Structures are given as structure tokens and as C-alpha cells.
Design an enzyme around this catalytic site. Sequence first.
Site, PDB file in Angstrom:
ATOM      1  CB  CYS A  70      17.256 -13.694 -18.459  1.00  9.92           C
ATOM      2  SG  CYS A  70      16.438 -12.599 -17.177  1.00  9.92           S
ATOM      3  CG  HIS A 109      13.126 -15.224 -17.181  1.00  9.06           C
ATOM      4  ND1 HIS A 109      14.526 -15.667 -16.734  1.00  9.06           N
ATOM      5  CD2 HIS A 109      13.163 -15.892 -18.235  1.00  9.06           C
ATOM      6  CE1 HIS A 109      15.097 -16.504 -17.353  1.00  9.06           C
ATOM      7  NE2 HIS A 109      14.122 -16.673 -18.513  1.00  9.06           N
ATOM      8  CG  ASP A 124      15.044 -18.483 -21.456  1.00  7.28           C
ATOM      9  OD1 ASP A 124      15.823 -17.792 -21.302  1.00  7.28           O
ATOM     10  OD2 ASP A 124      14.803 -19.302 -20.196  1.00  7.28           O
TER      11      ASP A 124
END
Length: 292
Positions: A70, A109, A124
Site C-alpha cells: 500500500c 496503511h 485506496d
Amino acid sequence: SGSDIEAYLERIGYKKSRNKLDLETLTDILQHQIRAVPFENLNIHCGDAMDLGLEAIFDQVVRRNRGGWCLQVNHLLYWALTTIGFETTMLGGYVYSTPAKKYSTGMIHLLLQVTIDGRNYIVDAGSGRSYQMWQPLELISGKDQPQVPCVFRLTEENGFWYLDQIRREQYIPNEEFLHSDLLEDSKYRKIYSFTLKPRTIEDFESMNTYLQTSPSSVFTSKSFCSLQTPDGVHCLVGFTLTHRRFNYKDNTDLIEFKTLSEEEIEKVLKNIFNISLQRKLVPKHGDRFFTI
Ligand code: NA
């Protein structure tokens, strides 16, 4: 033109106009990225680093046709969206663990906020598997937001936002995998929590290092790569290749499982994920929590 933005759009197969900075265009870019750039950590399992800097990420994703985790894929998506002209913010979040019955202690994250003409969204491209939004989620507490993968819901409480999903039933035709640690059995799943506090990439560096080295990190425990398709998701974890087709029949997802030999992984990586590695992968399927 030869521009970096055009190189990125070529990488993701995005051949449309980008002159309207609207929800449709944002959604289209998100979709192209998640169908092109895998959510993966295979560098860790080849003995190489997970770089946090944009020049290195752009090279590996755009020029070397890789994906990333991520901190990489959302850093790139942030740069691309901002360059195109969207109003963007980096946000940090905490990932839910079923066994722990809580969100991660640390901020592991990276996700994004995009504001378009009076509406606020999160975006995302770095959740992967069946946790991956196919459209931006509007920041409206308690509202169901149905998408192909599932119904998503954001809820706000005391300055924290909580991303949850309502999942379909699962049909697993290969029952040798019914007891796999890869399977989420519940229809209700907490994904992550976050706040709207603006971040810079510097804020994620300590975790970038620790997630690559800690035996406690899922990223050192399991080798994985995930890519969304037009109707599902491919995910390899260790030697286990899965393909999910969303809503194949009657509010049910179909999940195919296969065990790959070491010799078969290279061809799967290329043919399914368009991943070509620099060195030999050592596939790993350790015990740390990671579902598909
Ligand atoms: Na920005």
C-alpha cells in the site's frame, strides 16, 4: 509526449481523456490501476527492499511492470491523481486483525482522500484480494455503498473512520482448502480504521522498514500478489493460487484454489499478474493473519 504521467497511464492501460476532474474519471483511473498494478510484496521474498521513494516506485511499477504494497501503490496513485489535477490528501490507517480482535497498534496503511466539487472520498488501490474497493467511497458515516466486490460502509466515531464490508457467501469447489487460513468465514468484516489528518510520506518510513524486517509482520510471513480482474480477483499466497469471481450466482462468490509447484510459479506470475522478478522468489506461507 514522453511525459511521466503519460508513461503511468500507459502502464495502467488508461487510453481515455483526463480533462474532466470528476467522479467518473477518478473511478476509471482507480479501476485501471487496480486491474494493472498488483498488490504484492514479492521483493521481500526475493531478498530485496520495499522502497518508499517515488522515483524508485515509479521505476519499478511503471518501467519494470511490478506492483507493490500500500505504501508504494497508493504513493504512486497519489502522485498520478495530483498530477492530473485532483485535490488529494494522504491519510494513515490501522488494519483490522481477526485473531487480535482489534486494529493494528501502528499506522501501517496509506490511503488517500480526494475532494471533488463539494464531495469527499477515500481512494485506496492497496488493499487487494476481496478487500479492494472498485470505486471511491464517499465519506458519509453509516451509508451503504454497494460495489461489485461487496457492500462497503464507512462509519465515523470520535474522529476515527472505520471501513467495513458486507461480504457474499463463498463457494469453494475444492474442499481440500475449506480449512485454509486464507478464508474469511464471516459475511461481516472490519477492514481498517483511519483519521482525516493529512500525512506526508515521511510519516510512514519507520513502518516501511519495520514491516520488511519484523518476524511479527504479515509481510515477512507470507509472500503474496493480488490483481483485480473485470469480474473478480486473482491472488497467490505462498504456493496457493486463488481466483475469485464476484457474484457468480445468487449472492455468492466462487473461489478456485490450486497448489502450484515451485516450477509453475514463474509462468503464473507472468501470465496472470504480468510480474517478472529480478531474482528467485522463495515462496512462503507462514502463520500470520492474511485472508483473501
Ligand atoms: Na495533494
